[PDB]
Design a protein around this motif. Sequence first.
Motif, mmCIF file in Angstrom:
data_model
loop_
_atom_site.group_PDB
_atom_site.id
_atom_site.type_symbol
_atom_site.label_atom_id
_atom_site.label_comp_id
_atom_site.label_asym_id
_atom_site.label_seq_id
_atom_site.Cartn_x
_atom_site.Cartn_y
_atom_site.Cartn_z
ATOM 1 N N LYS A 1 0.839 -1.186 0.000
ATOM 2 C CA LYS A 1 0.000 0.000 0.000
ATOM 3 C C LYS A 1 0.873 1.235 0.000
ATOM 4 O O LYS A 1 1.949 1.240 0.588
ATOM 5 C CB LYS A 1 -0.905 0.044 1.248
ATOM 6 C CG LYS A 1 -1.978 -1.006 1.324
ATOM 7 C CD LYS A 1 -2.749 -1.063 0.047
ATOM 8 C CE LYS A 1 -4.093 -1.704 0.256
ATOM 9 N NZ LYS A 1 -4.888 -1.602 -0.999
ATOM 10 N N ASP B 1 -3.138 1.043 -3.760
ATOM 11 C CA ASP B 1 -2.407 -0.209 -3.977
ATOM 12 C C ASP B 1 -1.248 -0.009 -4.933
ATOM 13 O O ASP B 1 -1.378 0.672 -5.929
ATOM 14 C CB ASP B 1 -3.338 -1.316 -4.498
ATOM 15 C CG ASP B 1 -3.088 -2.655 -3.817
ATOM 16 O OD1 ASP B 1 -3.931 -3.065 -2.996
ATOM 17 O OD2 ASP B 1 -2.039 -3.287 -4.069
ATOM 18 N N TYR C 1 -0.232 -8.326 -9.206
ATOM 19 C CA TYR C 1 -1.644 -8.667 -9.063
ATOM 20 C C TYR C 1 -2.233 -9.267 -10.339
ATOM 21 O O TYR C 1 -2.853 -10.326 -10.312
ATOM 22 C CB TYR C 1 -2.443 -7.438 -8.593
ATOM 23 C CG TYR C 1 -3.924 -7.677 -8.304
ATOM 24 C CD1 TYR C 1 -4.366 -8.811 -7.600
ATOM 25 C CD2 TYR C 1 -4.885 -6.749 -8.708
ATOM 26 C CE1 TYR C 1 -5.730 -9.022 -7.334
ATOM 27 C CE2 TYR C 1 -6.251 -6.950 -8.445
ATOM 28 C CZ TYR C 1 -6.660 -8.082 -7.760
ATOM 29 O OH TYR C 1 -7.996 -8.259 -7.505
ATOM 30 N N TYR C 2 -2.002 -8.598 -11.460
ATOM 31 C CA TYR C 2 -2.643 -8.945 -12.719
ATOM 32 C C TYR C 2 -2.138 -10.235 -13.356
ATOM 33 O O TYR C 2 -2.868 -10.869 -14.103
ATOM 34 C CB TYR C 2 -2.467 -7.817 -13.716
ATOM 35 C CG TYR C 2 -3.104 -6.502 -13.344
ATOM 36 C CD1 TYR C 2 -4.490 -6.377 -13.178
ATOM 37 C CD2 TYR C 2 -2.327 -5.357 -13.219
ATOM 38 C CE1 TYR C 2 -5.069 -5.138 -12.865
ATOM 39 C CE2 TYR C 2 -2.896 -4.123 -12.909
ATOM 40 C CZ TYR C 2 -4.254 -4.021 -12.731
ATOM 41 O OH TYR C 2 -4.781 -2.797 -12.433
ATOM 42 N N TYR D 1 -12.285 -3.751 -7.096
ATOM 43 C CA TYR D 1 -12.066 -5.143 -7.478
ATOM 44 C C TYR D 1 -10.899 -5.306 -8.451
ATOM 45 O O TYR D 1 -10.003 -6.116 -8.233
ATOM 46 C CB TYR D 1 -13.363 -5.750 -8.041
ATOM 47 C CG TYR D 1 -13.307 -7.237 -8.388
ATOM 48 C CD1 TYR D 1 -12.691 -8.171 -7.537
ATOM 49 C CD2 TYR D 1 -13.899 -7.716 -9.557
ATOM 50 C CE1 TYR D 1 -12.647 -9.539 -7.861
ATOM 51 C CE2 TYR D 1 -13.862 -9.081 -9.889
ATOM 52 C CZ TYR D 1 -13.238 -9.979 -9.038
ATOM 53 O OH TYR D 1 -13.217 -11.309 -9.374
ATOM 54 N N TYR D 2 -10.901 -4.504 -9.506
ATOM 55 C CA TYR D 2 -9.962 -4.661 -10.605
ATOM 56 C C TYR D 2 -8.526 -4.264 -10.276
ATOM 57 O O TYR D 2 -7.600 -4.768 -10.894
ATOM 58 C CB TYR D 2 -10.423 -3.849 -11.800
ATOM 59 C CG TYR D 2 -11.744 -4.254 -12.402
ATOM 60 C CD1 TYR D 2 -11.937 -5.522 -12.965
ATOM 61 C CD2 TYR D 2 -12.791 -3.344 -12.470
ATOM 62 C CE1 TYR D 2 -13.163 -5.870 -13.552
ATOM 63 C CE2 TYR D 2 -14.011 -3.683 -13.054
ATOM 64 C CZ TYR D 2 -14.191 -4.937 -13.584
ATOM 65 O OH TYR D 2 -15.396 -5.237 -14.152
ATOM 66 N N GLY E 1 -7.306 -4.328 -6.958
ATOM 67 C CA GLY E 1 -6.955 -4.867 -5.638
ATOM 68 C C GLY E 1 -7.045 -3.858 -4.500
ATOM 69 O O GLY E 1 -6.597 -4.129 -3.397
ATOM 70 N N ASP F 1 -9.782 -3.242 -3.212
ATOM 71 C CA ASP F 1 -10.841 -3.760 -2.372
ATOM 72 C C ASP F 1 -10.206 -4.605 -1.280
ATOM 73 O O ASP F 1 -10.879 -5.107 -0.396
ATOM 74 C CB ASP F 1 -11.853 -4.558 -3.190
ATOM 75 C CG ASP F 1 -11.227 -5.707 -3.942
ATOM 76 O OD1 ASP F 1 -9.991 -5.804 -4.026
ATOM 77 O OD2 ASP F 1 -11.988 -6.538 -4.455
ATOM 78 N N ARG G 1 -19.378 -13.694 -6.673
ATOM 79 C CA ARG G 1 -19.228 -13.578 -5.235
ATOM 80 C C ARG G 1 -20.579 -13.248 -4.637
ATOM 81 O O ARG G 1 -21.070 -12.117 -4.733
ATOM 82 C CB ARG G 1 -18.203 -12.507 -4.870
ATOM 83 C CG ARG G 1 -16.761 -12.893 -5.081
ATOM 84 C CD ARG G 1 -15.930 -11.680 -4.808
ATOM 85 N NE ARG G 1 -16.536 -10.503 -5.441
ATOM 86 C CZ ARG G 1 -16.048 -9.268 -5.374
ATOM 87 N NH1 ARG G 1 -14.947 -9.028 -4.692
ATOM 88 N NH2 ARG G 1 -16.660 -8.271 -5.985
#
Lengths: 196, 196, 196, 196
Positions: B60, B79, B84-85, C84-85, C87, C89, D90
């Motif tokens: 973060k 973020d 991640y992707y 969501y897309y 990260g 979240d 979800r």
Amino acid sequence: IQRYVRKDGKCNVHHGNVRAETLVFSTHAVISMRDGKLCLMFRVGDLRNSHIVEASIRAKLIKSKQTSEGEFIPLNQTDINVGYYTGDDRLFLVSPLIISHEINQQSPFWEISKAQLPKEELEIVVILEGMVEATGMTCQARSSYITSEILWGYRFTPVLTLEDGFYEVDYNSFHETYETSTPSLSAKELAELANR
Amino acid sequence: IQRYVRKDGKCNVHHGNVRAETLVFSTHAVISMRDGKLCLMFRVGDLRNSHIVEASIRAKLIKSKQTSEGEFIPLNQTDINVGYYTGDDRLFLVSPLIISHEINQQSPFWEISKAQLPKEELEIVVILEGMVEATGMTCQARSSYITSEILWGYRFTPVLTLEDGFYEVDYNSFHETYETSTPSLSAKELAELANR
Amino acid sequence: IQRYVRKDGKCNVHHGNVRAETLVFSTHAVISMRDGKLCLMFRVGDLRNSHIVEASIRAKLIKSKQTSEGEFIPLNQTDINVGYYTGDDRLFLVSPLIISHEINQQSPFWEISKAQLPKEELEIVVILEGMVEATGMTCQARSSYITSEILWGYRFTPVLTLEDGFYEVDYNSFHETYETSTPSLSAKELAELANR
Amino acid sequence: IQRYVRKDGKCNVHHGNVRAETLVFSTHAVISMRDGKLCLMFRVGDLRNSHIVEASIRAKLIKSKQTSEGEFIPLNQTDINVGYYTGDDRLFLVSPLIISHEINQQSPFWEISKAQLPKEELEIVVILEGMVEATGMTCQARSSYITSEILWGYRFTPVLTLEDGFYEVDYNSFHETYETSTPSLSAKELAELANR
Ligand SMILES: [Gd]
């Protein structure tokens, strides 16, 4: 047509099971075409006597590398695509499955021909994670393929047969593989050639 | 070629281990080029005496900001991309790894030059989550880098060596870093300049 | 510059804590601009006396609808984008955070003006999931905003202040919100108007 | 307007509940239009007496296939899209929900007309995973639809009604479905025809 899974969720595999024993990966990996795409495939067995929930497969490439700026990364790691983007890495493991990595432009094997294969110093780590239904606890299972354990121009023997309204697994055939006609050009090389 | 991981899943790291001790992050962060991309890298150690399953890394950015409309967000969070992707944030942690964030257009550091770095009031929180194999329980490990702990123009010392069919980790070198030739232009500035 | 998180992972929030008490959502939701984008924001508190690992936020829209073909879906559900897309979240919850949903073309609120707001029959369900560090067990926390609880043209009062090398939370200000200059045009309407 | 979920997280469904009993899938699947898209829908019930946290739905297609190169895959698996990309997979499961798979170009059903349907040898495995709030343990629930259990041109009966400030579920209607006007052209065929 005989169901794989009954309306109540119980699968029709391995007559007379009860759904420690350990999960097995195929000893070898294969490469060959599937619908005009070159693929690396290994096989991953089930647990005869229980389900694995939230089951998932991922694979790492272990290969030392030098960056253009001279930085040397010993045993550097990169993810191999085995269904991440479409959720096909999320397994329904109730009989052995052939896991397939399509060798595309983003794949580490894109530029690797058959002759080139055995000169390359690399390792594929396969890692299955999931929760054992009975046990309650989170499992991990690991294995490894080095260069000499990747067979170019091969396919996995099928292990699955329908006997008496149940599907049975010929575990003898598990690591069995057979040869198939297969170009010796690298994926890249194939793309180039097809593009004219 | 000596395997990292054996066919049966046991890794060939730390001779004579048994796979509370706590996980260590490098004390510092570095920035430097890797294949023509500017990168921020920190290092994250393993647990000598057990695996971590479903292991993952995220980071973060903590930085107070004012929105164009005058709203002041103290210690606002965003973020930082660390795989991640592509699922590269999903770690196979069996020896310390250098985690890398490529500084691209979407990265918070895109417009930050070397001279600009030390004037910026910001903090990087690194957070590793995962399940301790033995223990059964979900762990979290945290650390933090403020501005003065980010070293521009540096690289991580390698810690990994092959001794007697096993890979051993020189933990003395863990936080060690060395200087390397590195532009002092911001990533943006580099992109602009390269685009002519 | 005083750290939020120390090198060893312990945060510098709530002097003298020990890291059942229950997590609180703000009573209201707000809408207003942030960097030229219209946003819906609600606030979600921390747990004073422990961390939440693998913490995540998601939100559902509850609204009855008729399909073009006449099918009536009572209390139909659709996901509201809250990071969501990217990260985002995935929360680092160690002091209350304003969660923000950018109202874009894919957002259910895209065509909803200020005057239009209070005529709409809808509900926002906010759901935080995560693992309580101490307890070991997976928690879920839920709340709900109906139309009259969404305030157009408002912002959340900041609750965070730096006192004596620690950050303290003014929990009295938690549900407090203040008014701010804000167009009464729908997001869509704003996009259209800006596009000339 | 009567809330579905109260400010404190308790839902207003099933008056006098206490939030083993087992979760039920609808016995049948339906196909029909929703906003000009052809959809496959099945229904998945809740657990009357507890929540399921980190609840998720996924579906597999079981169908034997031959690759262009002659490789025969018995009972081959591919993922059916049921909200993966938008996080609509979800679930907030507090009353039965109709799960919908939009039949688009990437869907396995793209080329399958009504007349073609009953000639196809295929199986849909539906799998719900999640954590039972009370119990603490991770659950999995499975079911299966073969060809004859997929009804073309149908819709699910609504089961939900508002009685006395609470929402009650008519479980008799659960597997009930009704007929609706519906083209017999395959999704592909519809796209083609609409594109002129
Ligand atoms: Gd989990």
